[PDB]
Amino acid sequence: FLERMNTLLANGEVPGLFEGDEYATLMTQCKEGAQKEGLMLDSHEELYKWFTSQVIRNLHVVFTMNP
Amino acid sequence: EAVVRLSCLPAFKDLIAKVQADEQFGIWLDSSSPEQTVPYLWSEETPATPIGQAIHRLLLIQAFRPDRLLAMAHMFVSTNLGESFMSIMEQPLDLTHIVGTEVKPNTPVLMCSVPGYDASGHVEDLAAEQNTQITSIAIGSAEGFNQADKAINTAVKSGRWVMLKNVHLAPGWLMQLEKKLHSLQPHACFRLFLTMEINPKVPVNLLRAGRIFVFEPPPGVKANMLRTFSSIPVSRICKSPNERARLYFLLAWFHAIIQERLRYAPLGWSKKYEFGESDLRSACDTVDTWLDDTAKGRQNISPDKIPWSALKTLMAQSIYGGRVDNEFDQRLLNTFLERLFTTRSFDSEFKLACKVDGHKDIQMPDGIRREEFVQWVELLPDTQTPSWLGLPNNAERVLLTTQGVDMISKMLKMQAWMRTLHTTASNWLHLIPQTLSHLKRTVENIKDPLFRFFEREVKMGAKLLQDVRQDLADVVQVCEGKKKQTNYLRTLINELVKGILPRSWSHYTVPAGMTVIQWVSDFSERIKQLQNISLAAASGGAKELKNIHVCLGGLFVPEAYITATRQYVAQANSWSLEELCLEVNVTTSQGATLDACSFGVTGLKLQGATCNNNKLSLSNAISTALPLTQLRWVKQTNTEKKASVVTLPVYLNFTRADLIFTVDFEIATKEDPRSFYERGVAVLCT
Amino acid sequence: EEFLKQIREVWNTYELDLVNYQNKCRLIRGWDDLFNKVKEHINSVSAMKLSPYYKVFEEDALSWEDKLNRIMALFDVWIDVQRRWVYLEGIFTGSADIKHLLPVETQRFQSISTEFLALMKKVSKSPLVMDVLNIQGVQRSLERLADLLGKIQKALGEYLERERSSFPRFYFVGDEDLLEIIGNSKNVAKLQKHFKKMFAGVSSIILNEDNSVVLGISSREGEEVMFKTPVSITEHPKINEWLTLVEKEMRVTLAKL
Amino acid sequence: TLNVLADSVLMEQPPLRRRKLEHLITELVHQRDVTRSLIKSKIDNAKSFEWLSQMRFYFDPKQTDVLQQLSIQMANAKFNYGFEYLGVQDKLVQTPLTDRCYLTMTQALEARLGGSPFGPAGTGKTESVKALGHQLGRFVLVFNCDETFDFQAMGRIFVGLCQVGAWGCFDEFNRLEERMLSAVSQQVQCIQEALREHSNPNYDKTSAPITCELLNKQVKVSPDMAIFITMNNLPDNLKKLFRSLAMTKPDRQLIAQVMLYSQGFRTAEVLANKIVPFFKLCDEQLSSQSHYDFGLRALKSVLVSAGNVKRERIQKIKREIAENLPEQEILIQSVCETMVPKLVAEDIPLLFSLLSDVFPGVQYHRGEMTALREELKKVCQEMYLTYGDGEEVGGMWVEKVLQLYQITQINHGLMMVGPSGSGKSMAWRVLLKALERLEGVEGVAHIIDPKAISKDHLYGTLDPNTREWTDGLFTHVLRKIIDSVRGELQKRQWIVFDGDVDPEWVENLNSVLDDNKLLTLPNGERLSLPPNVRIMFEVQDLKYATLATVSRCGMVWFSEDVLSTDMIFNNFLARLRSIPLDSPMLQIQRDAATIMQPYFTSNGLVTKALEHAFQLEHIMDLTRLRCLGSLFSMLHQACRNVAQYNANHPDFPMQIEQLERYIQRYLVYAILWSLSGDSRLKMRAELGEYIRRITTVPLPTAPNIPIIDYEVSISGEWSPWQAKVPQIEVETHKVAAPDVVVPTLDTVRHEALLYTWLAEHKPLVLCGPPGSGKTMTLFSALRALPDMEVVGLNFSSATTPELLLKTFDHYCEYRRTPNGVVLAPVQLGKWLVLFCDEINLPDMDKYGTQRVISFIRQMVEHGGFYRTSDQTWVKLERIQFVGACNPPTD
Ligand SMILES: Nc1ncnc2c1ncn2[C@@H]1O[C@H](COP(=O)(O)OP(=O)(O)NP(=O)(O)O)[C@@H](O)[C@H]1O
Ligand SMILES: Nc1ncnc2c1ncn2[C@@H]1O[C@H](COP(=O)(O)OP(=O)(O)OP(=O)(O)O)[C@@H](O)[C@H]1O
Ligand SMILES: Nc1ncnc2c1ncn2[C@@H]1O[C@H](COP(=O)(O)OP(=O)(O)O)[C@@H](O)[C@H]1O
Fold it and tell me: 10 Å Cβ neighbour count for D851?
């Protein structure tokens, strides 16, 4: 459950989550979001980079412990 | 030491002058029952209550003559909670009232017996007197479970009782029975009895939900022999040549001996062997078969024609001897069998036991039929000393002493810890020496076996000392909470507060049930000895190692010391190890000079005998310390040892569980080696 | 509502995977995935049956639960029929002597296999799960398949117990080993790998040139004991009778030696 | 008769007749001992128990029934010989303990009880039971409890024991699991109750068959069967049904004497009296290791080997009566040949001291083997290795190679064990090529990592429904070898199992390592290992291997003492002088090696610096080969830098004086950055002071700045790193950006180190505390290079080599056109560098190893790996690994 938080914290993405049809669907919704923001299909790796940047500027995960 | 410890109390500060001034204290020490008349020794400013007098006398008995402590213990209760408190316990258990009232039909009655005993007789006889039937059932077989189920259902529906024998073989089904019994039982007269053996596999819930009854076999040779004769059917004894009956008596007597010697586990049998009813039945079958084979007809057969060799060999190597592992217990069993089973046993002058109570002897009955032997059994006097079994009379005293400390342990086992843990750890750190270094591993004189052996000893001793000191420092740091506490340290602190030595600390052999305080004291002694060894090696080298009076008890692996000594003697003069045999000479001087082959050993303690001029003699007093033992390795001359020597074992601690080696001691001409064998004379390293 | 659509499209586009088995049929692979999907769908149907908005989709949820229950009840029998069918196919087709020893059971298995192969061709022609479920009398046929296979398996077990009783030393070898022993009776080469399990020191049998008479026995290290009166397999064709004769003659020749 | 047998056994006999002779000698010795003393002690009656106790045989051939012809009587117990053929079995030496065991066992059997020979393991309880069963000619089955137990076979086995009338002995009953033990005890109780009721005094004439309840059915119980339960207590069910017997101390002094007499030795008594205490001393004085075995079985093996050696010496003398041999010399030589290879280097002087103590004045001379010791020299010279004889540099390693050859000849299933950094792989590689050059038989070695693949991939899997068997790596290799479609027979095939050993992946390997040489696959197929195939276990510690696998394999122990530092230095210098880092480059390498030769001596600067760096504190455990290899790589980079400078200056190239200064300064710089290059600043400073104290090469004259902060320039002078630190001005919008790398002292020093260690493609791990910029520095250095493509893998706590495999599938491709399958990046000319942060974080399994770490080790050391798709060895090119991880103490 942990060390997946650490990677998205140090970089902003977890590369192991997206593969195959999941990666293709993520690519599709990424290009749709690019159209919404005014961008285009461009490159698939570039769309993944756009997804990563949007995650690092938008996502804020909050996680709680007891001392 | 006991007086020194007791004088720490303010009421006993003048104990030393009190004991010196009194002159009847010496005769009081040797009295049969010191607890009856304890001299007024404690110093008190005001007269004390009788309970206080009992407490002070109990303390004195713990100091002087601890063996009577249990007896004194009884007196204390009688002086506090009233006389005849345990008197009902001595009276035979009248459990008919217990099964009538005070026991609900819901609560089962469990009858737990010591292994080798049966409890169904009492309940069966009470059923006979209370004219209520019981469906007695054995739970050995698979059909036994369903049979018990239908029987208990029928009896709870009608109002009868049920029996379930040897239920310790079905623990899970016992739990199921407890769950089933937890339901309401409509009838009130229904009673469920669980005859059973004391075994830890059984459920705790059943024990909690039922009334437990502990049954023991009564101690005494007479009681054991009567039980054996009652167990054997009469027809077996009164059949074939009449001598059979006598033989059975002999067997019975023998059995009783090797059972009653079991209660004295360290002195008399080394370990706690089973020697149960199965061995007795096998011996009975062997005697029956061999008597039938030798004497075809019913006519009486001459005592010399009895196959004595067959019985002796079969009951020394197949029955009663299969479970015997070490050589010396086998030798003792052979001595017993040869003493009893011989053609002399059929004479009127045969002595089953000699030296009993100093001069009295157990004369063998002059009988031919079973009834006379049974009558002789019933006429045995109650004053049965351990001298009947061949043990010295003081063994009983020793046994009582053991029970005494066990009792204390139980009181300790059944009785804010940071402060006391700190003070104990600090005291131990002040007690345990700081550090010894590996001043070893010299290229020159590596060939000396003692050098290598002491290198290994010093290495592993310093290693384990560093480990113990590190753990103790960790405990010190945590008791103030100056650092965190880990799982290993949690286990260590729990084991320390419970008073059991840590498992991570015991890297060498240890007596069972040893307290941490005694363990660390022996640690300090061993570290002092190893530091002396290192100092001698540094000062003189490898030569000085030979001329050291090393104690075997302190050394962690004494057999390795003996091996290294053998190698050292073999290397000098260029001998091979097979040709070196060990010779022990007891020297009075603690620092007597050693020749090229003698090595000094101190701390050896002889039990049951005293040595003078390398000659042994039997004595009542135990733990006769040997002044100095010279171990010599001489070239074997290939001769047969004379009949005036004994091969005494050398155990390491008082619990005779591990054997180090054997010593050939010459005995005085008056005694015989058989008496040495039966009395359990031995040498202890500690 | 959307989850119902997801379930509908999942089970309307689901296809049964088929893998070839010895160029005989195309058998179903992916039992674990299908079972997990069915169990998850059933649990979710029961879960949203508990929902407050369930009254709107009550009839659709009930119909879909009925469909899922039918699918589960079919496939839990289909997997058992599969495992049994491959087991009996392996044992009745890997040997040639199995026909003689159990002829009526072999005929029953031939019938059950013909029916199963017809069903397998039918499902192969339409691998969709809804099409498979809609085929006429699939559950009844599966029940008959399973019960006949269970009965023939019990008969096979009884026959193996009878063979064990006839020759006690067969109790040491396993069920598979004993099956290979009886099935490969004609070729003694496959028998010699089991002789080290039944007998004590015997590791092979020295036979005639045509493997007709058992000339003697041979231990593991090559020591040979020659029977004084050789036992003929051609006269006692049954494996148990001539094996018992071998053991008895071995004891007799040992005594004579 | 004994004299005739002893004369005959000395000659040459076929092995079967040899075994018959030894059995006859043992039985005749026992008979002589019985008659000489136990019967000649004034005994004159045939009914005296001194004679009835001995195992008597009575033959009545007139009886028609075969089972009734021979009667075996002992004490009052009578049995009929079962006449079950036993082949040729090992006969036990009848020690007095064995006689007592026989007496008690037949006494128990007569009373229809069972036998419980309890005692410590290794006293021969199961062997004694088997010998008793074979004496009466009964089939005996031994149910080993070493987790090879089950209900389904055990129930029917009990039914068979009841039916046919065989014997059943349990090797160690106490080791069974509690429920297993209880159920087996229930079945044993049923069987033994049936046996007990079979001899009812009122029902002695058994009219109705004696029956018992097993497998939920009635089973007839034959009167001749029995159950023996060997222990190490008995269950409460069986306490009243079994007779116990203590077998604690077997009489080794008599076993050794009897076997040495059977082997032909004429002084067996003295040799036994020497060799039993000697093995006791070997067990006690010597250090404790898992693989040592000084029990009775080892003594028996040593004695039979000594007999073989004496017979071979007799044959050699004859081809060139003969009873003047030094039998003690033969015994000690056999002991050495059997025990020295599996001894640690520390214990060898201890073993020889014990041998001198017990065998005084008897010396051991090893075999010369000058025929192969010359091919070893040639192969070592051709591999740029170091070879030496005896006390010379190389004696220990060559002796280890000779011992490996000896154990290879003796048996298959070798096990080379030694701490990481010893000459293990090189030893067997050199042995293989030397054998191929000597005998003319081509040697082929298959290197397999058992942990790189799962057990299913290693051995094959069966389809759960399709019932189709697909073979794994080892199974496919064995099948390919046995099929000989190419001619792998007549070629020495060595399946070396590089890696560690755990009781999981070797479960099917016990059946082939032992004398069976048979691999049993789950599908039913059986494979026989051909005689020209040896399976080697190249392991490191042998701490998580069961005794069953260890005892089945001959062993050679490779201590770190074997591979001395001079060996490593000589090999490095030879490779520098011979192998180019790519002729002018070779000339530069030779000049550099000539310059640094004085420092790479026995007591040179490098050795002293190493002995110092060992005492320091390092974040990871120091290994001699790790620092030595990093140093060698950095010197290779120094030579490359010299070549590059010469290329940049076509006129006036590097001169001898300037090259000498540059090489001496670079050597100190490389010692500083290789030894203690993974430590704190204080440790680096301490090592700098120490090397300053010893060395004579010029050092930076500044007494304030530690030398570690300095560097060596191409001109041959010490220059500060601070002068090479540039001043950068990042854009305002890019302050504290994820990718901005402001240069600093660390950023440039580690940059130079990274370039140096990536020139040789050596994988490296940037271990440092969290937040130190390890990944940032690594990415900057990697992406600064134009021909390097970087892929970042975050190793999670559940990371498996499947993540790696997916990585090469996504980024690389398989190409068949070379000699073997090649895994190469899709981009041409681009060296794919696999980034692995948190490389140590993946979890160790139950047996103290990491799966992905072992995969990386295999793919780095060998250059490739086996793919499970078709079980073939793909070779990696244009692929590097770079790692990063937090300190292990975290
Ligand atoms: N030379 C440098 N140039 C630029 N930024 C640097 C430099 N050294 C350190 N930093 C910064 O220091 C921080 C180091 O964090 P980071 O780059 O994530 O290293 P890290 O190895 O991933 N830490 P961790 O993975 O948890 O062990 C980042 O904010 C870097 O930008
Ligand atoms: N004479 C020599 N014999 C053996 N190795 C030598 C010799 N001279 C130098 N060496 C070096 O010693 C090393 C031997 O390593 P080897 O392959 O034997 O290790 P390994 O035990 O298989 O590895 P690991 O440490 O992973 O277990 C090599 O670096 C080799 O170059
Ligand atoms: N009396 C004996 N004479 C000769 N060899 C013996 C004797 N007892 C044991 N051995 C040897 O000891 C070895 C191991 O004994 P084993 O039966 O495995 O011990 P355990 O009973 O603990 O399993 C056997 O190979 C056997 O040859």
Answer: 20
